Amino acid sequence: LDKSKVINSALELLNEVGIEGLTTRKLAQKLGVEQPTLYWHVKNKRALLDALAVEILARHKDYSLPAAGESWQSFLRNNAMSFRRALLRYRDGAKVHLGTRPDEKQYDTVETQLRFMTENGFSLRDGLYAILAVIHFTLGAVLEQQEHTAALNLPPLLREALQIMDSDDGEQAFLHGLESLIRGFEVQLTALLQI
Amino acid sequence: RLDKSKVINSALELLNEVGIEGLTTRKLAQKLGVEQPTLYWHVKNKRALLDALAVEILARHKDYSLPAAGESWQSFLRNNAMSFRRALLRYRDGAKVHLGTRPDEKQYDTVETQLRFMTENGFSLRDGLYAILAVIHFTLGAVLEQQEHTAALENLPPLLREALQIMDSDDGEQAFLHGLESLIRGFEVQLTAL
Structure with a gap:
């Protein structure tokens, strides 16, 4: 699996459960992958949020x-x-x-x-x-x-x-x-x- | 004895311990050693809890x-x-x-x-x-x-x-x-x- 994939599903999950409800575990199940697998892409909620923040700007902060x-x-x-x-x-x-x-x-x-x-x-x-x-x-x-x-x-x-x-x-x-x-x-x- | 202030004080302590995300009715109930429902006898709901905490934080530390x-x-x-x-x-x-x-x-x-x-x-x-x-x-x-x-x-x-x-x-x-x-x-x- 690659970024865009993880990221897009994460953004999709974020809208579903919100930030507090967002967990790397839910993302893993969301992606239907093993947690250990996802881990090396997103090691913790902190990393996930950082990746999300980055992606959100990259996609929508046009200026x-x-x-x-x-x-x-x-x-x-x-x-x-x-x-x-x-x-x-x-x-x-x-x-x-x-x-x-x-x-x-x-x-x-x-x-x-x-x-x-x-x-x-x-x-x-x-x-x-x-x-x-x-x-x-x-x-x-x-x-x-x-x-x-x-x-x-x-x-x-x-x-x-x-x-x-x-x-x-x-x-x-x-x-x-x-x-x-x-x-x-x-x-x-x-x-x-x-x- | 369980009362609003004790709920607020524990909530503040808990908030200071695990952050707002960890500040759950369940965990707060746990920390207080009571059944979650009972908390609602003193705090309408968690939003009211959070509101109460906000008011309490300013009451204690916003001296101006x-x-x-x-x-x-x-x-x-x-x-x-x-x-x-x-x-x-x-x-x-x-x-x-x-x-x-x-x-x-x-x-x-x-x-x-x-x-x-x-x-x-x-x-x-x-x-x-x-x-x-x-x-x-x-x-x-x-x-x-x-x-x-x-x-x-670097x-x-x-x-x-x-x-x-x-x-x-x-x-x-x-x-x-x-x-x-x-x-x-x-x-x-x-x-x-x-």
Whole structure:
């Protein structure tokens, strides 16, 4: 058996039982193979999740590198929305991504992304933090979206607040916070670039 | 004697012992030495359990919620966020337990003050809310990433190599504060434009 096979069945299983219900043993039976066999492909749940996170981005995170002439603001915005769309493709997708560092095969992309940020005036540290903030914000928002759904006296302001949240799926909150981050990054960058 | 607090304390201990995934009614019942059903006499269900744990984590470790006299809204958000983060980092998966949750009746007053505070500083309910939600989402994502990576965890390109050296500098606190400040500067830019 090979990756695409294991992986596709794993993604199929993930949608069926969710992340907590996902076990290498279930994947083995899912694939109708011996656990010892599967083991060398996916040694533990951790490895499986890492493989899944990687595959999910590879298949659905269509945006990663900025186009020639693209602004850094747009680069960050697209990386976020693309990341978001990919995580939403599968059940517990955000939870699956948690704790997965880039694969070596994405290193060149990451270096390019980092270089791009520095070419735009960001110190490597600030460019890195901006990217991390976008990623973290996106995870939090998606985790919240994919969650609160399954999870299904009030002061006036609060009642109204909760009312506003019910009227949204989460995309509005995500885009708002995302644009705040970028605008925040803008003010800071401009200020610093004056030195 | 079995009572809600003992269920919460054991659940917290258990959560800290095996994580949210290992936090099962069965195992919790086991740890408590009682039949699962009896737990429901004190906690409607596991979602209620998780909600209760979330409330308890903040009750014990989130020492900041309301702004000090004459505190700026920027400071109010920054302190809430940082205090929220510290509380979430206290327990394994403390952040996951908070996912999907909503204000408990015991937090209503606090939350109203917080939203009211935002409205009194220039924000409309909607924007003040979105500002807070953005902070919450950023904080949840950053903490979950932190915790999850620590749980799990050559010649390299100069930038990634440096980035890796920067991320090993701390638990993620500096990256968090930078992102949090960026958010606040973002809200600030927005508010100003009215």
